[PDB]
Amino acid sequence: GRVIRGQRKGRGSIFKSHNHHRKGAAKLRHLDYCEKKGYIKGLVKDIIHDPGRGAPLAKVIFKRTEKYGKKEELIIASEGMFTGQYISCGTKAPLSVGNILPIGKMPEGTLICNLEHRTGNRGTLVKASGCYATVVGQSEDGKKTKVRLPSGAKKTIDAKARAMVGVVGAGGRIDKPILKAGVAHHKYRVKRNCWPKVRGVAMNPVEHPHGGGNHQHIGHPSTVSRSAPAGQKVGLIAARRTGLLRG
């Protein structure tokens, strides 16, 4: 056989991200003494569209404290935040929508985004449009707090990790039915070369384990083990179950 499409993806030739018009990586402020023991307020000057993603980005201008001047940060905007608004980042920042706080300072039940799964990595979790995590518990001694992620998984992160208060905007995007193939074409034109798909069952056996035959069927179970090699992992990978969920 030959190398299958999934295997070709990792070579990164034509499958690199289409990022010509991206506005920059969305990262919150690098950890600083000001955020460790106080508040620093940045003024949001514009809310822009990053072509790759659905969530709007916010350009926030902070005034540097080490030297005279301003620094521009590209944060992922939470819903309801508006140009001309001052957002506070730090341990003593008030709990308000758009502010960046350590998750240990937030009470239980607050909705957060731009979660830092490890302290200081300036934003890793809960970043897609409309997503939010919930602070569902703080440790007795502090130093640790538990959140519920948009997938429903419970995660335990040290209390010093920062997050934005609120929900990342552009929520409900998935609700619109893409009516036609052209809209999907335009959607993936600015993301990747993952579209159109072409079913493996419509291929020839040389290029896909599903290909071949006189009737367009899989012919062998489509659930493959987690240890299957690269050209073999092609169906439902390491599936614990199949068919419709019932609850």
């Binding site: 659905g54 939470s78 552009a170």
Partner: protein, 85 residues
């Protein structure tokens, strides 16, 4: 006079796609193309610029909102809980 009985703005799609799909897209396009109340100036003139960005024609001020509406119930509820304290 009244031009289309029920399709409304989805008359642009003709007969293509399902009726259910067209009705679903109508429900959300109605609010995507609607004007909302700008709480900064009080004039109902904030329209969607991009998927999540809403700009007021008068203020020229833009806010981050929903994909198809200025606000979403989840964000509104979260702000309500925050502002309760």
């Amino acid at each position: 006079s009244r031009r289309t009985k029920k399709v409304g703005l989805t008359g642009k799609y003709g007969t293509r796609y399902g009726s259910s799909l067209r009705k679903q897209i109508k429900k959300i396009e109605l609010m995507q193309h609607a004007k909302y109340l700008c709480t900064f100036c009080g004039k109902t003139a904030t329209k969607r610029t991009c998927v999540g960005i809403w700009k007021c024609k008068k203020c020229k001020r833009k806010v981050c909102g929903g994909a198809w509406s200025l606000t979403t119930p989840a964000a509104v509820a979260a702000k309500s809980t925050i502002i309760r304290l």
